[PDB]
Amino acid sequence: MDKGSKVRNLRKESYWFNEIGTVVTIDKSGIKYPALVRFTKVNYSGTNSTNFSLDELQEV
Amino acid sequence: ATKFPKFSQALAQDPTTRRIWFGIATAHDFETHDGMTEEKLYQKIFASHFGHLAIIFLWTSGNLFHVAWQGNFEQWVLNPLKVKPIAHTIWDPHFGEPAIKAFTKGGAFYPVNIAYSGVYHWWYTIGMRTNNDLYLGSIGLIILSGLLLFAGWLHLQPKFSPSLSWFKNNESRLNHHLSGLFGVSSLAWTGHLVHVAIPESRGTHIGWDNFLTTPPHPDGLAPFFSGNWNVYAQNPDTAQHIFGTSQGSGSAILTFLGGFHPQTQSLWLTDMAHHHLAIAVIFIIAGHMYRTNFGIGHNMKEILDAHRPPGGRLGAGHRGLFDTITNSLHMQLGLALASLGVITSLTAQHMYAISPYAFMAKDFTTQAALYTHHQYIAGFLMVGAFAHGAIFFVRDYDPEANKNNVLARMLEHKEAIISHLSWVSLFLGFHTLGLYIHNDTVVAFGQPEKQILVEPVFAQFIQAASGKALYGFDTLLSSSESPATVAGSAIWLPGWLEAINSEKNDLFLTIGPGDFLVHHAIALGLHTTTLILVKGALDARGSKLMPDKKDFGYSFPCDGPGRGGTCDISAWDAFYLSMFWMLNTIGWVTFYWHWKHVTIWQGNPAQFNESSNYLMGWLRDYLWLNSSPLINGYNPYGMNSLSVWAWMFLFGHLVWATGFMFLISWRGYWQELIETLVWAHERTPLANLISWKDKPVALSIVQARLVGLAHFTVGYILTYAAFVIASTAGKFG
Amino acid sequence: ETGNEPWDPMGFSQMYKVNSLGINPHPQWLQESEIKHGRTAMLAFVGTLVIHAGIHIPGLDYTTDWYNSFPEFAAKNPLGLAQVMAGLTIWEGHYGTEAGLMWTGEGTRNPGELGFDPLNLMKGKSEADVNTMKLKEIKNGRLAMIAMAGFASEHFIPGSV
Amino acid sequence: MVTDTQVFIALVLALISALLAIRLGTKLYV
Amino acid sequence: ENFLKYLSTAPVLLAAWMTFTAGFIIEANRFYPDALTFPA
Amino acid sequence: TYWEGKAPPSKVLGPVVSQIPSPALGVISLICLGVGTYSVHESNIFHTLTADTINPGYIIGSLLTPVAWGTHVASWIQKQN
Amino acid sequence: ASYLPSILVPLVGIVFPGVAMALLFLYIEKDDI
Amino acid sequence: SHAVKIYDTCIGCTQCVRACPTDVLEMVPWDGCKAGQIASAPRTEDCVGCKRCESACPTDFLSVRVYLGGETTRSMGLAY
Amino acid sequence: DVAGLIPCNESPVFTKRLNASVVKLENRVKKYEAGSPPALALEQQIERTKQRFDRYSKSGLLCGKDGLPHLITDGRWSHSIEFVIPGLMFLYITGWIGWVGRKYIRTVGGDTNATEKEIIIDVPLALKIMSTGFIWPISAWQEYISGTLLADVSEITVSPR
Numbered sequence A: 001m002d003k004g005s006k007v008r009n010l011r012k013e014s015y016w017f018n019e020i021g022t023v024v025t026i027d028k029s030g031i032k033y034p035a036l037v038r039f040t041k042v043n044y045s046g047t048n049s050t051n052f053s054l055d056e057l058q059e060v
Numbered sequence B: 001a002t003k004f005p006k007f008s009q010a011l012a013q014d015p016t017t018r019r020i021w022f023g024i025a026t027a028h029d030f031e032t033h034d035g036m037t038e039e040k041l042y043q044k045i046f047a048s049h050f051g052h053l054a055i056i057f058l059w060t061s062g063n064l065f066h067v068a069w070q071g072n073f074e075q076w077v078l079n080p081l082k083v084k085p086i087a088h089t090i091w092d093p094h095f096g097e098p099a100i101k102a103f104t105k106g107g108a109f110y111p112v113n114i115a116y117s118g119v120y121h122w123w124y125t126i127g128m129r130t131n132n133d134l135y136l137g138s139i140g141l142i143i144l145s146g147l148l149l150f151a152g153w154l155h156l157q158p159k160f161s162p163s164l165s166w167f168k169n170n171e172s173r174l175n176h177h178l179s180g181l182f183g184v185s186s187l188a189w190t191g192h193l194v195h196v197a198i199p200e201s202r203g204t205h206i207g208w209d210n211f212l213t214t215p216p217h218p219d220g221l222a223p224f225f226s227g228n229w230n231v232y233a234q235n236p237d238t239a240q241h242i243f244g245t246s247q248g249s250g251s252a253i254l255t256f257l258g259g260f261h262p263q264t265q266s267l268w269l270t271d272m273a274h275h276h277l278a279i280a281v282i283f284i285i286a287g288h289m290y291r292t293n294f295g296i297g298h299n300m301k302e303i304l305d306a307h308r309p310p311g312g313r314l315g316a317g318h319r320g321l322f323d324t325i326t327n328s329l330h331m332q333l334g335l336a337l338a339s340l341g342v343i344t345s346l347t348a349q350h351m352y353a354i355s356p357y358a359f360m361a362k363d364f365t366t367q368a369a370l371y372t373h374h375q376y377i378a379g380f381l382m383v384g385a386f387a388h389g390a391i392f393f394v395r396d397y398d399p400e401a402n403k404n405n406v407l408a409r410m411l412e413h414k415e416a417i418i419s420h421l422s423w424v425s426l427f428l429g430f431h432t433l434g435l436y437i438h439n440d441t442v443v444a445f446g447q448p449e450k451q452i453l454v455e456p457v458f459a460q461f462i463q464a465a466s467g468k469a470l471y472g473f474d475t476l477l478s479s480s481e482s483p484a485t486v487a488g489s490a491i492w493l494p495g496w497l498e499a500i501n502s503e504k505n506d507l508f509l510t511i512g513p514g515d516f517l518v519h520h521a522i523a524l525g526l527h528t529t530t531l532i533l534v535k536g537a538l539d540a541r542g543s544k545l546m547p548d549k550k551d552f553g554y555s556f557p558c559d560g561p562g563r564g565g566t567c568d569i570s571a572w573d574a575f576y577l578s579m580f581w582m583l584n585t586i587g588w589v590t591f592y593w594h595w596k597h598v599t600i601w602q603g604n605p606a607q608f609n610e611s612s613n614y615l616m617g618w619l620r621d622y623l624w625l626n627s628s629p630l631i632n633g634y635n636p637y638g639m640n641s642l643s644v645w646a647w648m649f650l651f652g653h654l655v656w657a658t659g660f661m662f663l664i665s666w667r668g669y670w671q672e673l674i675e676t677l678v679w680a681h682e683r684t685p686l687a688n689l690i691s692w693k694d695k696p697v698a699l700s701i702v703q704a705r706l707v708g709l710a711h712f713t714v715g716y717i718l719t720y721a722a723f724v725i726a727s728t729a730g731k732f733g
Numbered sequence C: 001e002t003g004n005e006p007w008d009p010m011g012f013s014q015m016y017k018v019n020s021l022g023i024n025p026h027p028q029w030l031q032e033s034e035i036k037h038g039r040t041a042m043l044a045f046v047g048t049l050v051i052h053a054g055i056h057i058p059g060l061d062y063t064t065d066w067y068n069s070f071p072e073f074a075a076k077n078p079l080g081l082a083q084v085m086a087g088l089t090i091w092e093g094h095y096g097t098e099a100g101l102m103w104t105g106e107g108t109r110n111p112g113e114l115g116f117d118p119l120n121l122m123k124g125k126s127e128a129d130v131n132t133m134k135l136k137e138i139k140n141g142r143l144a145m146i147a148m149a150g151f152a153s154e155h156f157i158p159g160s161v
Numbered sequence D: 001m002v003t004d005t006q007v008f009i010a011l012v013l014a015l016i017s018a019l020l021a022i023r024l025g026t027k028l029y030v
Numbered sequence E: 001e002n003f004l005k006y007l008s009t010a011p012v013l014l015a016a017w018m019t020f021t022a023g024f025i026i027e028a029n030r031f032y033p034d035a036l037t038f039p040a
Numbered sequence F: 001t002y003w004e005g006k007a008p009p010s011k012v013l014g015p016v017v018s019q020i021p022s023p024a025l026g027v028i029s030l031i032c033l034g035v036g037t038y039s040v041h042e043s044n045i046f047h048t049l050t051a052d053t054i055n056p057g058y059i060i061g062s063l064l065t066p067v068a069w070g071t072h073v074a075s076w077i078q079k080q081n
Numbered sequence G: 001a002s003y004l005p006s007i008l009v010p011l012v013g014i015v016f017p018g019v020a021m022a023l024l025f026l027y028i029e030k031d032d033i
Numbered sequence H: 001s002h003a004v005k006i007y008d009t010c011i012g013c014t015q016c017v018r019a020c021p022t023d024v025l026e027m028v029p030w031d032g033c034k035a036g037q038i039a040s041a042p043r044t045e046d047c048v049g050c051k052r053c054e055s056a057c058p059t060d061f062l063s064v065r066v067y068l069g070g071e072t073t074r075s076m077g078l079a080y
Numbered sequence I: 001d002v003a004g005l006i007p008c009n010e011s012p013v014f015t016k017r018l019n020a021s022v023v024k025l026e027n028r029v030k031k032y033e034a035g036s037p038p039a040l041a042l043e044q045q046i047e048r049t050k051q052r053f054d055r056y057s058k059s060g061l062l063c064g065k066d067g068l069p070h071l072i073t074d075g076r077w078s079h080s081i082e083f084v085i086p087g088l089m090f091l092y093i094t095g096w097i098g099w100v101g102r103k104y105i106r107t108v109g110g111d112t113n114a115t116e117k118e119i120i121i122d123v124p125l126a127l128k129i130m131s132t133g134f135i136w137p138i139s140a141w142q143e144y145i146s147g148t149l150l151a152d153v154s155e156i157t158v159s160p161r
């Protein structure tokens, strides 16, 4: 929704499913997955951020 | 077409030796065959089942023929306690003269194997007495197998192939396979027992030539129709009855004596006849439950849809299970395998305790062999049931058709199931191993009085409840002033109590701390194997590591070293891992049974009660002590009849070790070695003429794990079979 | 009066907040159970007090000392036991549906309110008709439960008076 | 005590069954 | 500061605490040995 | 026949039972339970069962108890509506 | 009887497996049908 | 040959293409991503199935996926 | 009594085991001079063995046909000393441990360096938490009824849930 806002993940395949992550950047220039989110826990690959579509995030 | 495996174009185009190997391992997976439809799948399964029945009946006919032609069945039935039953002759040109002289036993005049199948006792009990009867049975079975093979061929013709709707006619199949396959079959078997087995046991020869004129009972169906069925229970065989002769014989054909026949130490034939009559009646009544184009009956889809508790704790209840079960062959295959495994375990548990066959329970080797055999088969069947359930989840489950279903809710809270199973497994393992090591340590320091010996109060209480007047509990049938004993006092309580309280039996063996610890070890084994299999089945459709696992199928090697490494991540790998635990737990069970029975047979059961509380006791008093007659099958001084079993013992050890070769060392090393081997072959004169047609490559990862597991299992089974047979037959205990 | 406020040390009432998919009883179920126990305890107090020192009902034998009474009751008067059990079963069956709904908050019937008013009482107006006497019933029932526990404990150890 | 005639007829019936097995397998049709 | 912080590391603290637990268990078994069951 | 709510549709009881009013099923269930319990008690509880004490009537009555349970469930289903 | 094993065991353990493996080897690498 | 699929979650960082040892993957112009590029697998006949591309993927779950299938001389990593 | 077990006080096999242990120790000590350190050690071992056997005889354990004590663990209060009493202690101790651990996890978890505080323990805070475990049951129950013990369904899971 906005920079720095916490969002609950809804991507079923995501390692951070049902977890809270902070939005880093949002691309207003179209794009299918514009909302970059960062989570505290690192996934199995060691990364802690991913791009999601606004439909795949619960706002708060 | 175009190569060996038609059913796989991808494998057909494979230029390596892999094409051959997988061509063997994908043959019976009809679902994956190219150009395969549901109807052809069902018809091919039907024909294959016909072929398998033919194989079973030919195996049985072979057993009968070999016993008749080379056995000593007549000599055995004459004196069934002292002579040893014969399996078949040994025509081995590799034998030396001392071997021929050593393996000549029983009837003699040729080398021979002593049968440990117990088929002699079974055939004697069911009324057979002469080699002619065995031969006639074998000829009948050969004809039956030929008939089944012809039927299998016939039901593949275009005009005789049953339609797809026919296979999925669940109601009629259940009706006929309940009332007909189970009930009418049981009715026929009790008819045999009344007409043949019982008269043969009472010294009267009934055969095809005279069974139509000698009624099994002197009154002859007059009491049956008149309602005076009590007539058939009057005048049973008195305790002073010599089995197979009219000495002390009776006339009853349907009684409820209970207990055991004193002379044979087995069940009364009349009791078996009454049992099977009642079972046949119950099954025949049960088979009229479902409707088959006759108006009356139940429709199972409605039953399943209707059972959804209004409390909502089961969600949508059983809605949609009918479609999943009927449309999925893997789910019903798993259900059948599980039920068969439970029944195989039940047969193993009940034959030893409740001897059904005359003069068995004195042929110790046969009893041990049968128990171990059926327990191992039960373990295999259970593992297969869970494996096919995982397969069903992989390729037959439809999450949209099972929304909020009971089965879907199984996956919804899979984490809880797996975590609590893991907790139970850890709890049992930690504490059982801790108690065993505590006993080992205290006994090691010469302080056996410090052992934690826990009395199995609950099992002993159950034994007392059945009438075991040894623990002084005074509960239920063990106390005279109880409704249960008085109500049952008239019918079967006297014989059952006489059998249970007699210590010359396997009915409710006395138990102590050793039995307690071993039972908790068995619980650990069952829980851990179930944990592995259930985790495989539930995570078959995906995990956090592989959220799209279902897309890779049931059996795939891995998903690469990425994101931490994913070796043995598929459900097939869960089955492969669980096979080791199944073997380990079945081994524990069989070790427990064999050691307890060996100590009882030797006449010093105290040895087990003393030495089963610490592991060194198991290693010394059971494995080290009872293997002496086995490893001495052949020594530099000479050889004896057990030499074959010692050789098989070493062979099983070798195969078991060879399995580690495939289980530890993985493919890359072997592929890099085969590279050099290929180079060497290609660069050799006089051998460049001969060139492989299939490119030689190392075994695939999944294939290698399977082959290692197969070697492990074969070696395990062969070595333990050799041990259990040889020790028992060498020390007669 | 424990402060005239809900006395729930160990907080057994509040666990309905955690849904737990209906595992934990709703307050209505606990309330109905408490009233049932209180009524049973008071009637049992009458029974203990009289039977312990009593001539006993005229009938077959019927010599008992309140601790061995039930076996003698079953042996001497089987028909009586049969009709007692049948009547209690019928009463419990008539209700129970509402009790089953009372495990959750779906009872639809006020806890402890059964169709038993042999003498009509609509005089009360405060809250539930004479809510104060409902409190009186629950209070004397709690005390009766205390009394049954006291007799049962005095059985083994002479606990008090 | 099975005579040679009995063994021979058993072998004949086994041969018939074997031929039927051959045909059934062939009909399963790889 | 640094030395004490090092002493606060997981392995050092685990070793120290397990040594302490083993020590008091050993002493308890030394003063009340062969304690299969609780005194009345 | 999948049903939600608190009471299943009458069609679950089958073509015949589904048409029976609740009081009839209740009385039938009470009669069946009484007969079955009485039969089960007369033989093997109040009297020991022997070879020559097998009464077909008592066997039928004993079998009638599950019929009593089914009829009481059906009566409740009919009662809810 | 007492002569058959000599005739058959060699056939079942040598001749039969030999011919069976020969035919299977021919068919596996036939390269057509 | 193995089947290599690229999903629209890709962020076009090129890492999968770089990691590929058999030059199966490549970059093609795209508009659904910020970088304007997406991975493609035009020539999967040369894919060996090492799954290096998946290992070298930033996206939560493997915008590039490899599914092993029929094996040929090329995909079997055989110099013979 | 229980399952055909005779109390170890009157167990001939128990006394035979005691005699065997003592006599074997005496045979071992017969090869040392009186007063030698080995002799004193063996005499102390003999005394400890006698005390152990006397304590077992006086405790009330049940012997088997083998003469060794057996444990009854069906809940029998007369034999609680064997399993129930120690078990409770265990469930207390471990409980304490567990509770304390959880608290630490939930105390340092609200920091940026939460990981760095697990390899390196905050010994002052760690001891602060550890000293509070003696009331772990009460605190656990209070958290349970207060909803602060369990996380909501909104937590990590897998594709099929």
Ligand code: CLA
Pocket (backbone or CB within 6 Å): B045, B046, B049, B050, B053, B166, B167, B169, B170, B172, B173, B174, B176, B177, B179, B180, B181, B182, B185, B343
């Ligand atoms: C009365 C009619 C009848 C009968 C006798 C059968 C019988 C059979 N059917 Mg058929 N079937 C029927 C009606 C019938 N069916 C109808 C109406 C349909 C249409 C829906 C089908 C459709 C159908 C299909 C599609 C298939 C069969 C199959 C089978 C076979 C199952 C495998 C087997 O050997 O059974 C096992 C028989 C037993 C008696 C074992 C009972 C199991 C218990 C657990 C064993 C316990 C026994 C005992 C205690 C152990 C001691 C014995 C020991 C001493 C030897 C069996 C021959 C299958 C098959 O193999 O085809 C050839 C198959 O694929 N049936």
Ligand code: CLA
Pocket (backbone or CB within 6 Å): B024, B025, B026, B027, B028, B029, B030, B333, B337, B380, B381, B383, B384, B385, B387, B388, B391, B554, B555, B572, B575, B710, B714
């Ligand atoms: C009647 C029951 C039954 C039926 C119809 C099937 C049928 C099937 N199973 Mg199931 N299965 C069963 C029982 C059954 N299985 C049991 C009991 C287990 C537990 C062990 C399993 C475990 C299992 C697994 C784990 C898998 C299957 C699979 C399959 C499918 C392919 C099988 C195949 O290609 O065979 C190929 C046949 C072979 C490779 C032959 C191997 C024979 C053994 C291992 C070697 C024996 C060596 C011998 C004893 C050595 C001699 C000793 C001497 C040297 C001394 C097929 C639909 C597979 C699948 O994907 O299905 C979709 C699969 O992954 N099954």
Ligand code: CLA
Pocket (backbone or CB within 6 Å): B422, B423, B425, B426, B427, B428, B429, B430, B433, B528, B531, B532, B577, B578, B580, B581
């Ligand atoms: C003797 C061999 C052995 C042993 C002891 C175990 C033990 C275990 N296995 Mg393994 N396993 C083995 C062989 C063995 N396995 C083999 C050959 C296979 C086939 C590949 C498997 C496959 C397998 C799978 C697939 C699974 C297990 C599981 C388990 C657990 C079962 C529950 C249990 O007992 O918890 C109690 C734990 C033990 C008995 C382990 C020993 C613990 C000791 C006593 C503690 C010692 C602490 C001590 C201070 C160490 C100090 C070290 C220091 C000196 C350096 C446990 C960890 C299951 C599991 O994880 O359950 C949660 C599971 O899912 N195992």
Ligand code: CLA
Pocket (backbone or CB within 6 Å): C089, C090, C092, C093, C094, C095, C096, C097, C100, F072, F073, F075, F076, F077, F079
């Ligand atoms: C599981 C068996 C079962 C089921 C599903 C029912 C269901 C029903 N009964 Mg029946 N009932 C039962 C057993 C059962 N009863 C027994 C044993 C008796 C005593 C003989 C009665 C006596 C009875 C009467 C007198 C009446 C009902 C009535 C009713 C209906 C509404 C009241 C109600 O459910 O709560 C009533 C609650 C109970 C009776 C408590 C039963 C608790 C049982 C004993 C617990 C056992 C279940 C257990 C969890 C199963 C575990 C199995 C596992 C170990 C394998 C409802 C259809 C009423 C009705 O039909 O009105 C129209 C009615 O008036 N029931």
Ligand code: CLA
Pocket (backbone or CB within 6 Å): B005, B007, B023, B024, B025, B027, B028, B033, B044, B048, B051, B052, B055, D018, D021, D022, D023, D024, D025, D026, D027, D028, D029, D030, G008, G011, G012, G013, G016
């Ligand atoms: C219960 C056992 C059993 C059954 C019923 C089947 C059934 C089937 N298999 Mg499977 N299979 C089995 C065991 C079994 N298989 C085993 C153990 C293996 C090895 C792991 C395989 C490996 C395998 C492969 C690789 C393939 C099959 C195929 C088939 C199908 C038809 C094959 C056929 O008969 O063609 C015709 C074959 C024959 C007519 C030969 C019959 C053999 C005769 C009777 C031998 C008689 C010789 C006699 C003993 C000689 C004695 C002489 C003496 C005097 C010296 C059918 C579905 C094929 C299939 O359908 O795949 C979809 C296929 O491709 N199977």
Ligand code: CLA
Pocket (backbone or CB within 6 Å): B055, B058, B059, B060, B061, B062, B063, B065, B066, B088, B089, B090, B091, B142, D007, D010, D011, D012, D014, G004, G005, G006, G008, G009, G012
């Ligand atoms: C599955 C059942 C079975 C088994 C395991 C055996 C096993 C044996 N038989 Mg026997 N046999 C059987 C059935 C069986 N027989 C039947 C039904 C007959 C009646 C024809 C005979 C008649 C017979 C004779 C006359 C002789 C043997 C002999 C032998 C031994 C050497 C093998 C040999 O030369 O075969 C010879 C067997 C045949 C030529 C007929 C084939 C046997 C069965 C019917 C084949 C079953 C195939 C099975 C279903 C699996 C097929 C798959 C396979 C191709 C991989 C061996 C112990 C010999 C012996 O005693 O040596 C000491 C011997 O001389 N058998």
Ligand code: CLA
Pocket (backbone or CB within 6 Å): B419, B420, B422, B423, B426, I097, I098, I099, I100, I101, I102, I104, I121, I126, I127, I129, I130
């Ligand atoms: C304080 C930390 C803590 C807590 C509260 C729990 C609590 C629990 N664990 Mg976990 N666990 C822990 C640490 C912890 N565990 C560690 C360190 C390991 C790795 C060895 C595990 C491995 C583990 C497995 C594999 C399983 C559990 C399970 C369980 C549950 C049942 C109890 C049990 O089996 O314990 C088992 C405990 C162990 C096997 C090892 C515990 C080792 C020590 C004693 C704990 C750490 C103490 C630590 C020093 C804290 C210091 C605090 C200080 C700094 C102030 C329960 C939810 C089971 C479950 O899921 O049940 C549903 C289960 O299957 N645990």
Ligand SMILES: CC1=C(/C=C/C(C)=C/C=C/C(C)=C/C=C/C=C(C)/C=C/C=C(C)/C=C/C2=C(C)CCCC2(C)C)C(C)(C)CCC1
Pocket (backbone or CB within 6 Å): B330, B331, B332, B334, B335, B338, B342, B385, B386, B387, B388, B389, B390, B392, B537
């Ligand atoms: C994977 C899977 C699967 C499978 C599963 C399984 C395999 C299961 C198993 C299960 C089992 C394996 C179970 C078992 C059971 C058992 C039982 C259930 C028993 C019971 C018993 C009882 C209940 C009782 C008895 C008795 C009586 C009668 C009374 C008294 C006591 C006695 C004991 C005597 C399927 C396919 C589905 C699909 C999905 C997934």
Ligand code: SF4
Pocket (backbone or CB within 6 Å): H006, H010, H011, H012, H013, H014, H015, H016, H017, H038, H039, H053, H056, H057, H058, H059, H062, H063, H064
């Ligand atoms: S590595 Fe992944 S994110 Fe990067 S270009 Fe390749 S597919 Fe896209």
Ligand code: SF4
Pocket (backbone or CB within 6 Å): H004, H019, H020, H021, H022, H023, H024, H025, H046, H047, H048, H049, H050, H051, H052, H053, H054, H066
């Ligand atoms: S699996 Fe290996 S060869 Fe195939 S596309 Fe990925 S990196 Fe390239």
